[PDB]
Amino acid sequence: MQEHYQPAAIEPAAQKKWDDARISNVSEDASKPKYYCLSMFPYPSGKLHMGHVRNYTIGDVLSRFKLLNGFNVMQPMGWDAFGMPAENAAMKNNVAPAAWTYDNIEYMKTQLKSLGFAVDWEREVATCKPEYYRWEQWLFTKLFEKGIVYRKNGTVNWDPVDQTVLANEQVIDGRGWRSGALIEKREIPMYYFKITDYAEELLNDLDKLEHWPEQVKTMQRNWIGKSRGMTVRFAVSDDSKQGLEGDYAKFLQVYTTRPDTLMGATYVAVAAEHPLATAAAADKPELQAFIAECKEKKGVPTGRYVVNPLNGDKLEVWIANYVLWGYGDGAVMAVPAHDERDFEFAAKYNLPKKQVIAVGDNAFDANRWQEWYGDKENGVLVNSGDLDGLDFQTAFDAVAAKLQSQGAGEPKTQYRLRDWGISRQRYWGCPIPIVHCEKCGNVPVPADQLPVVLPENVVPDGMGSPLAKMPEFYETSCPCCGGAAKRETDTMDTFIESSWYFFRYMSPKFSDGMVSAESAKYWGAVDQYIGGIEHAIGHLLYARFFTKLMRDEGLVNVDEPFERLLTQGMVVCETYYRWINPADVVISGTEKMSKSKNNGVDPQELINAYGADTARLFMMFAAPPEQSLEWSDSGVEGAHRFLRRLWRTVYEYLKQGGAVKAFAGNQDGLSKELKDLRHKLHSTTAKVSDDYGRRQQFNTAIAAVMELLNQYDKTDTGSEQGRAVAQEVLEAAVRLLWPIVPHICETLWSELNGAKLWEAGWPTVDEAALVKS
Ligand SMILES: CC(C)C[C@H](N)C(=O)OP(=O)(O)OC[C@H]1O[C@@H](n2cnc3c(N)ncnc32)[C@H](O)[C@@H]1O
Ligand SMILES: [Mg+2]
Numbered sequence: 001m002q003e004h005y006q007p008a009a010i011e012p013a014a015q016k017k018w019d020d021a022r023i024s025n026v027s028e029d030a031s032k033p034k035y036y037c038l039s040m041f042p043y044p045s046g047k048l049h050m051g052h053v054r055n056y057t058i059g060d061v062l063s064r065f066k067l068l069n070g071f072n073v074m075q076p077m078g079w080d081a082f083g084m085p086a087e088n089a090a091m092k093n094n095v096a097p098a099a100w101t102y103d104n105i106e107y108m109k110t111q112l113k114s115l116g117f118a119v120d121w122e123r124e125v126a127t128c129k130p131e132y133y134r135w136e137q138w139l140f141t142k143l144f145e146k147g148i149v150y151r152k153n154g155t156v157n158w159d160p161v162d163q164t165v166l167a168n169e170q171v172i173d174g175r176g177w178r179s180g181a182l183i184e185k186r187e188i189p190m191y192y193f194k195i196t197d198y199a200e201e202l203l204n205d206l207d208k209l210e211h212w213p214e215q216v217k218t219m220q221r222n223w224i225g226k227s228r229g230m231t232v233r234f235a236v237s238d239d240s241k242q243g244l245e246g247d248y249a250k251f252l253q254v255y256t257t258r259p260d261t262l263m264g265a266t267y268v269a270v271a272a273e274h275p276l277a278t279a280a281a282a283d284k285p286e287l288q289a290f291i292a293e294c295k296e297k298k299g300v301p302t303g304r305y306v307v308n309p310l311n312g313d314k315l316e317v318w319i320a321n322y323v324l325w326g327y328g329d330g331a332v333m334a335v336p337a338h339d340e341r342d343f344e345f346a347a348k349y350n351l352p353k354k355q356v357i358a359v360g361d362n363a364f365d366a367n368r369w370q371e372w373y374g375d376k377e378n379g380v381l382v383n384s385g386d387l388d389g390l391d392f393q394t395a396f397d398a399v400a401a402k403l404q405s406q407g408a409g410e411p412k413t414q415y416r417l418r419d420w421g422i423s424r425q426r427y428w429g430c431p432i433p434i435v436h437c438e439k440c441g442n443v444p445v446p447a448d449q450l451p452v453v454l455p456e457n458v459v460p461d462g463m464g465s466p467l468a469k470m471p472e473f474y475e476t477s478c479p480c481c482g483g484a485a486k487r488e489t490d491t492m493d494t495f496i497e498s499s500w501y502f503f504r505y506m507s508p509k510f511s512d513g514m515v516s517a518e519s520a521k522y523w524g525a526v527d528q529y530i531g532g533i534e535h536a537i538g539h540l541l542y543a544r545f546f547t548k549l550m551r552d553e554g555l556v557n558v559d560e561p562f563e564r565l566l567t568q569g570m571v572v573c574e575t576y577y578r579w580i581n582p583a584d585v586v587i588s589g590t591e592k593m594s595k596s597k598n599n600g601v602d603p604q605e606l607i608n609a610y611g612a613d614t615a616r617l618f619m620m621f622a623a624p625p626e627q628s629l630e631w632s633d634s635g636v637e638g639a640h641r642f643l644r645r646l647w648r649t650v651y652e653y654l655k656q657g658g659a660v661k662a663f664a665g666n667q668d669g670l671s672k673e674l675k676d677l678r679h680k681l682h683s684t685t686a687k688v689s690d691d692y693g694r695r696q697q698f699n700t701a702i703a704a705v706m707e708l709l710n711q712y713d714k715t716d717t718g719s720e721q722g723r724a725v726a727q728e729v730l731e732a733a734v735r736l737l738w739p740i741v742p743h744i745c746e747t748l749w750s751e752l753n754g755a756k757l758w759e760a761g762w763p764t765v766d767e768a769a770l771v772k773s
């Protein structure tokens with residue numbers, strides 16, 4: 001054993017030792033229990049930095065920990081090759097997207113292999129490969145027939161810089177997720193995933209996720225935005241029916257979020273395009289000027305009356321400029337006494353305010369709005385008949401049974417979740433398998449003729465969809481009739497491949513479907529998922545929706561894709577722009593380590609200067625995995641000094657007697673200072689085993705091993721029994737730190753014990769060494 005700690009010699013040799021052993025290339029071995037640990041797979045938008053290194057190290061620490069405990073661990077690594085992240089980097093460097101992606105894929109693969117992660121590289125996947133995106137094309141066509149995927153025109157978010165439409169989850173604070181430019185609204189036909197059909201299921205199965213951060217679960221609940229309301233039909237008075245015809249001659253439908261205020265409704269609003277408005281304006285030019293006005297808050301009365309179905313009040317129908325047509329049934333009711341917007345609309349034209357809700361005993365001010373009138377949590381009913389005294393949860397249920405008895409209403413549920421538009425006017429993306437025929441229409445591509453191969457030899461000029469300028473691509477024959485037809489030149493979003501890549505890892509070479517029904521049953525769901533919280537509304541929701549699709553198609557049998565979720569904290573560093581890199585202007589301050597700010601420390605520059613063990617140790621020790629981590633060079637130096645201490649500790653031990661048999665069995669006869677050291681040992685083994693697999697607190701697990709070494713240095717171990725205890729302390733330490741730093745621990749383990757480390761396994765707690773003296 002050399003006296004100096006040389007990472008340049010111990011790390012490549014240990015990586016080859018692991019590669020030759022093939023301890024990460026796992027199959028469906030039924031002997032061991034499975035453990036699917038997954039880290040969010042990166043965008044090939046350039047070189048990885050230490051921020052990604054923390055993400056993938058946190059996953060490696062968990063994967064190596066379970067592996068040491070006799071687990072069949074699958075830690076796979078892939079490349080999120082399609083979409084804007086890679087294509088924008090290709091255009092920024094003036095390179096074809098296919099070339100820039102593949103060359104950066106092979107650089108990022110060598111970046112991760114230098115860090116020595118326990119990755120099953122035989123399961124490596126590139127989303128841009130046709131052997132991959134053919135199956136999301138397959139699922140696209142099968143869902144298109146079922147109507148779950150549909151094409152429709154409408155109002156969409158438009159990115160002027162990225163020159164493409166965006167989904168609602170890709171619009172961050174009214175700006176684009178990749179561009180930051182302000183989003184515009186356009187009328188463009190798109191392909192949508194009917195994610196609203198799964199809105200209720202995506203909301204209830206959230207409670208199943210007991211091992212998800214409650215922040216991620218809460219953000220999804222607000223994004224779905226479920227609200228329970230009431231659809232109320234107001235019978236038009238027999239005199240006010242003159243003019244209307246159809247359903248609008250019988251009743252007028254409204255939706256209200258607070259239907260406990262039904263009796264307190266003093267009037268009713270309507271839209272300008274509503275037939276009840278145009279019929280009342282056929283003889284009134286004062287309303288034909290309002291109908292033509294909007295087509296603030298203004299309103300005109302038309303003498304039309306509807307019947308409040310719960311008390312019989314004859315509420316007049318007002319034409320308002322705030323009732324948007326097409327949204328809902330194009331009409332609402334008005335309760336000014338318990339609605340701020342209706343209080344302003346009624347204090348504007350002097351309309352009644354029959355109070356119906358009390359909050360404890362706050363004196364009701366008639367013409368003074370107060371925040372207690374919208375209290376849907378601490379309110380009973382007044383002046384409502386058989387509703388007086390019922391809370392909102394009871395007043396809702398009583399009004400529902402009341403309206404259903406007359407047939408003038410029923411409860412209705414609404415979500416703020418809109419359908420998922422996936423059409424993109426970009427080149428680098430999965431082609432949409434739809435062929436437009438003038439005779440047949442939008443027909444899907446036959447499954448035998450999949451994939452619709454995206455030509456890789458394209459360099460976008462930067463002015464419009466490049467696929468719409470390639471006749472040799474979009475000119476084809478109709479698969480239904482055989483005539484002239486055009487291919488769909490729009491491509492899918494990058495969040496389509498990332499919504500099922502965790503299943504493709506189970507069978508990356510399977511040529512008959514998305515995932516083999518055999519391996520899908522063996523791996524089940526992802527046991528541990530690690531990735532940034534920025535995907536709580538986008539990817540982490542898209543993945544759950546795609547899983548419920550693939551399940552309802554018969555390809556997988558689980559409901560949720562990820563059991564546990566760990567949103568690791570962001571690594572931060574000072575930034576400079578004019579963007580300038582620290583190792584090479586203005587001072588932007590401490591910011592997230594990102595390529596879009598050029599404050600990223602390259603992992604390869606650190607391994608060349610300190611080694612992979614030093615970089616991984618600094619990431620795991622500087623802070624808990626969920627906490628933000630500030631980059632510190634002294635933190636890098638201190639982590640290296642400890643790895644020197646661990647190396648020098650084993651050297652001086654071996655240089656003073658050589659390897660002996662580690663102490664085991666009954667410890668009576670041992671001295672107190674050695675009984676105390678074995679006590680600290682097995683307290684550390686239990687503390688580390690608990691900080692890894694329960695608390696997931698790696699920094700305090702490293703600190704616990706350091707305290708064990710502090711007591712080892714303070715304990716005299718030169719005797720015959722001291723060496724045996726000293727052999728036990730070091731055999732435990734190099735196995736406890738192995739998930740954090742496997743290169744140095746594998747080297748020191750073989751210098752202490754001839755056996756293979758992973759067959760020695762995780763250190764056990766000798767509880768006899770824990771009892772006090
Ligand atoms: C499933 C897919 C939609 C994932 C998508 N391809 C993606 O986000 O990929 P991207 O290549 O952007 O990053 C890969 C991973 O690295 C994390 N990450 C990035 N910067 C930092 C940082 N400063 N500190 C800590 N962690 C960081 C980031 O949260 C992500 O889990
Ligand atoms: Mg459960």
Ligand SMILES: [Zn+2]
Binds near residue numbers: 437438439481482
């Ligand atoms: Zn046809």
